[PDB]
Amino acid sequence: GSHHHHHHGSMQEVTMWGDSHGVAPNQVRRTLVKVALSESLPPGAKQIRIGFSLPKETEEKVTALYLLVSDSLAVRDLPDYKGRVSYDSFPISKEDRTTALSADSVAGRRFFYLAADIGPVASFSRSDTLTARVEEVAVDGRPLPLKELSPASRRLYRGYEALFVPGDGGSRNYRIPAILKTANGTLIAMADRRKYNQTALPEDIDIVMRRSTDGGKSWSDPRIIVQGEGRNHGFGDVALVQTQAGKLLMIFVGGVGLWQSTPDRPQRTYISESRDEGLTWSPPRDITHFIFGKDCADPGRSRWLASFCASGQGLVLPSGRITFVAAIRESGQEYVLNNYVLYSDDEGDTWQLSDCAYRRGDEAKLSLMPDGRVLMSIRNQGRQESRQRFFALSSDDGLTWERAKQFEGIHDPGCNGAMLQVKRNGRDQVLHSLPLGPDGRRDGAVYLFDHVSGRWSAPVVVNSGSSAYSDMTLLADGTIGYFVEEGDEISLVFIRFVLDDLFD
Ligand SMILES: CC(=O)N[C@H]1[C@H]([C@H](O)[C@H](O)CO)O[C@@](O)(C(=O)O)C[C@@H]1O
Ligand SMILES: OC[C@H]1O[C@@H](O)[C@H](O)[C@@H](O)[C@H]1O
Numbered sequence: 001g002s003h004h005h006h007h008h009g010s011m012q013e014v015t016m017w018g019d020s021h022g023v024a025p026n027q028v029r030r031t032l033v034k035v036a037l038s039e040s041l042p043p044g045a046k047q048i049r050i051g052f053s054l055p056k057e058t059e060e061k062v063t064a065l066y067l068l069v070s071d072s073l074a075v076r077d078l079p080d081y082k083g084r085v086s087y088d089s090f091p092i093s094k095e096d097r098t099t100a101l102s103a104d105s106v107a108g109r110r111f112f113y114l115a116a117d118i119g120p121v122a123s124f125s126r127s128d129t130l131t132a133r134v135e136e137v138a139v140d141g142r143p144l145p146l147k148e149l150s151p152a153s154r155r156l157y158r159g160y161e162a163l164f165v166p167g168d169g170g171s172r173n174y175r176i177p178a179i180l181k182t183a184n185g186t187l188i189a190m191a192d193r194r195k196y197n198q199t200a201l202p203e204d205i206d207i208v209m210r211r212s213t214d215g216g217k218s219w220s221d222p223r224i225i226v227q228g229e230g231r232n233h234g235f236g237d238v239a240l241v242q243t244q245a246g247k248l249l250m251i252f253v254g255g256v257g258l259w260q261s262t263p264d265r266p267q268r269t270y271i272s273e274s275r276d277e278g279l280t281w282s283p284p285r286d287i288t289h290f291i292f293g294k295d296c297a298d299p300g301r302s303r304w305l306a307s308f309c310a311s312g313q314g315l316v317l318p319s320g321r322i323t324f325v326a327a328i329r330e331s332g333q334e335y336v337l338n339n340y341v342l343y344s345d346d347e348g349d350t351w352q353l354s355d356c357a358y359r360r361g362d363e364a365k366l367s368l369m370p371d372g373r374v375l376m377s378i379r380n381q382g383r384q385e386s387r388q389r390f391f392a393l394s395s396d397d398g399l400t401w402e403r404a405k406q407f408e409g410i411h412d413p414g415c416n417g418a419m420l421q422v423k424r425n426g427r428d429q430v431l432h433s434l435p436l437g438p439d440g441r442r443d444g445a446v447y448l449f450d451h452v453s454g455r456w457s458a459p460v461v462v463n464s465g466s467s468a469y470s471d472m473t474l475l476a477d478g479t480i481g482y483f484v485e486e487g488d489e490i491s492l493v494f495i496r497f498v499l500d501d502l503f504d
């Protein structure tokens with residue numbers, strides 16, 4: 001083995017991890033440091049003592065400390081599991097720097113969490129972070145060597161909440177975030193309820209929603225909107241818009257996997273609408289026949305094999321044209337997709353396709369440029385070219401397209417993300433979310449592209465660690481809502497900030 005293992009008895013081993021998830025004001029029992037014993041305290045043990053450090057700056061920002069003890073070693077803050085993780089909570093005065101528990105109180109458990117309640121104040125600047133470190137763990141007065149695997153650094157944001165966490169509602173997993181703000185200010189958050197594992201269609205997957213009518217301060221209980229009915233009969237990959245008439249429209253796929261779809265046995269595209277701010281939804285309407293396959297009225301598309309619209313959001317143009325970008329498989333000989341805009345000029349009654357927007361594309365998004373042109377951002381799938389994100393432009397409201405290399409300059413490890421057109425210090429810019437990588441789904445970042453200089457900013461990492469798909473919206477009061485896949489076993493996390501919190 002990698003280490004020398006002695007033969008004079010059993011050896012307890014202690015591992016610790018500092019936490020780096022984001023936080024927000026007033027949150028309760030936020031983990032700062034996790035400590036794991038390799039085995040239960042031995043039968044004759046009487047006490048464990050944990051000593052720690054916590055800088056004045058962090059002390060000033062918390063209202064209370066605790067030691068939590070659990071039989072489970074959890075990834076996220078213990079309240080995020082809604083009781084599915086059992087734990088006891090032992091208060092510590094915020095000024096103290098040591099705490100002790102009897103072995104009887106520990107009751108055989110191995111997992112300890114130094115946690116804090118967060119106060120009401122913050123600057124939200126890049127440097128506005130919370131930290132602590134466990135400095136000693138002693139059993140019956142005998143210290144143990146600590147293996148430190150990460151430092152603690154929790155950034156304060158104006159809002160931070162995991163909206164879908166593994167195990168919620170009985171679903172093992174969650175993926176594929178979509179966020180919509182309506183004109184009346186309602187927030188609709190949807191996801192794939194990946195009930196048995198984290199894998200894609202053709203697994204059995206449902207679509208789930210939560211809603212907020214207070215700007216994301218509080219969220220409704222999750223509701224299953226579309227129920228999967230078995231393998232090959234699931235649903236997922238939601239994108240959302242609100243039409244000019246006010247109705248909400250969700251588009252999604254169901255059925256077999258993307259690469260299993262064929263013209264005669266497709267993975268289908270469905271739409272559903274809500275006329276009451278997402279409280280109720282119409283039964284899913286299959287619109288596959290407008291796109292491809294056996295029932296399509298255009299014989300030139302009746303042998304196309306598959307199509308899916310990119311999860312997250314579409315775009316409703318000033319004209320009222322409703323758009324989503326589809327990635328379409330035109331040949332069964334190749335694992336290649338081409339992008340086309342799927343659009344409706346009649347509030348979703350009928351749907352048409354643009355001319356081809358991008359060859360060898362993948363999930364793509366739209367945004368409205370200051371002068372009315374439409375910008376497409378296309379996922380780079382298969383490490384093409386220089387591993388950069390791809391872009392294209394339309395000046396005819398999405399009907400025809402030309403590649404726009406002048407917008408290229410950010411790396412894409414091959415992942416969905418989102419755009420917002422913003423104005424900052426009088427300048428028209430694009431905010432784009434993607435993982436930073438490089439070459440992997442790590443470090444969820446945002447970048448600003450300055451339209452006039454044609455240059456991208458350095459990235460700002462919003463959420464360090466494993467990070468994948470993201471969607472973003474602009475709240476009415478100027479805040480940005482950023483809805484991201486955090487972690488290897490994903491939770492979908494809604495983070496609120498203003499641009500100056502990240503770029504100032
Ligand atoms: C309908 C469908 O399959 N959607 C899935 C897409 C596509 O497979 C790829 O974009 C095709 O290249 O990719 C994911 O698996 C991914 O990369 O995390 C998630 C998403 O659920
Ligand atoms: O023996 C039980 C142990 O409990 C500890 O708290 C103490 O510091 C040790 O000296 C030892 O007495």
Ligand SMILES: OC[C@H]1O[C@@H](O)[C@H](O)[C@@H](O)[C@H]1O
Nearest residue numbers: 245246247248274275276277
């Ligand atoms: O107010 C009643 C509702 O009626 C619907 O037709 C419309 O989509 C909504 O935006 C809302 O107007």
Ligand SMILES: OC[C@H]1O[C@@H](O)[C@H](O)[C@@H](O)[C@H]1O
Nearest residue numbers: 075464465466486487488489
């Ligand atoms: O990598 C940093 C973090 O992001 C994920 O990977 C995971 O949930 C955490 O265990 C941690 O590893």
